[PDB]
């Protein structure tokens, strides 16, 4: 049939920040995952519910690509379990995950000489997240026992906080761009699948 846009998901100039990860439904395609797996540009390419070399020959109901940017150190946090700050308060992967995770270092796009403070991640949430929960609202948080009516005094904090992202940062503190594909292996009529 016709190809589908992996180009505008991987050749993306602007990747959304992690607390507001960007989701995209791609369908009605002939998807060639050989391009991704044969590309050496990635650092982590980990498929969970399938085998990465057998992705050409299946057929999927709908495939969703999530996209964001995180610190290089904690790209481990992206797993079906694997609790942690982004893994719990920011991006929650369901345990029964059937998809793939791709992450590559992008220190030369996201980290500027003065330091990039436009990338924010959420901290101090009242509770964890549902799997695949997008939470763009950041009201004032309550930490101690005060009434947080727009105040920020010593016990009423703001949830968002910035990464450093300087070119001098260590190999683990550099930004990594993450795109995670989740497949709907349902037996509805197929819409997206390779040759």
């Amino acid at each position, epitope marked *: 049939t016709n190809l589908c846009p992996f180009g505008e998901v991987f050749n993306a100039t*602007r990747f959304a920040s992690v607390y507001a990860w960007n989701r995209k439904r791609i369908s009605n395609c002939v998807a060639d995952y050989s391009v991704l797996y044969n590309s050496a540009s990635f650092s982590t390419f980990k498929c969970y519910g399938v085998s990465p070399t057998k992705l050409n020959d299946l057929c999927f109901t709908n495939v969703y690509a999530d996209s964001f940017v995180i610190r290089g150190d904690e790209v481990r946090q992206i797993a079906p379990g694997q609790t942690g700050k982004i893994a719990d308060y920011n991006y929650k992967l369901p345990d029964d995950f059937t998809g793939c995770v791709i992450a590559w270092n992008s220190n*030369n796009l996201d980290s500027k000489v003065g330091g990039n403070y436009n990338y924010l991640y959420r901290l101090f949430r009242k509770s964890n997240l549902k799997p695949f929960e997008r939470d763009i609202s950041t009201e004032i948080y309550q930490a101690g026992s005060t009434p947080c009516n727009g105040v920020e005094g010593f016990n009423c904090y703001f949830p968002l906080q910035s990464y450093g992202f300087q070119p001098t940062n260590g190999v683990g503190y550099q930004p990594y761009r993450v795109v995670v594909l989740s497949f709907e292996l349902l037996h509805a009529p197929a819409t997206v699948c390779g040759p």
Partner: antibody
Amino acid sequence: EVQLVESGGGVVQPGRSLRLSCAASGFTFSSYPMHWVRQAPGKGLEWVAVISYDGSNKYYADSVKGRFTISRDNSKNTLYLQMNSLRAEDTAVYYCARDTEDCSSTTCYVDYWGQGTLVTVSS
Amino acid sequence: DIVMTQSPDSLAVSLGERATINCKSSQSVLYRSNNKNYLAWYQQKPGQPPKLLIYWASTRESGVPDRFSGSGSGTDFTLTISSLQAEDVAVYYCHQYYSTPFTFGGGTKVDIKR
């Protein structure tokens, strides 16, 4: 203040190859990307290329991709653009133009422009 | 890519009157991780390099009279000139800076109505 002066340019023949250079002063030339913007007489501005502050990533336009090559000599504080296989539609006024890194990623909008050259294509 | 359409072509207005130019992008140039709106508004006098007038589609560049104002969001934006003077006969350009390649608009030769 930043002073950008665009050298080179003038007269070319169809199929010739030319080389423009912007000499910039007033700021750290190695910590700001740079753009080229073409403007054919009386038509309107059009993007051409872009660089990154360490001279690694280079993105072009659609009607140029594979014809021009844009490099950047940090040591001499200069920006070079090599034009190859010029067609009759490439006569225009070329502006160098300095970025201002505020956008989330590297490439961002452009704020300070330089006086234009007069690349003219006809034999 | 993302293509900008800027309307109208000529916008003739007499002094003291208002004015409004509009621009529509093919896709939605609106970053969401911040609430910033990647788009900018330049102007050009005849025979000079352009200037910057609006960035983030609303803010103003230092050194610009209050008479200009950029409004809009998503994929619809407008530059509003409240009052007109002698030094506002110039062709105005829109310019996204979301996805490479960047793109400009066709212009708007804001003349003087007499």
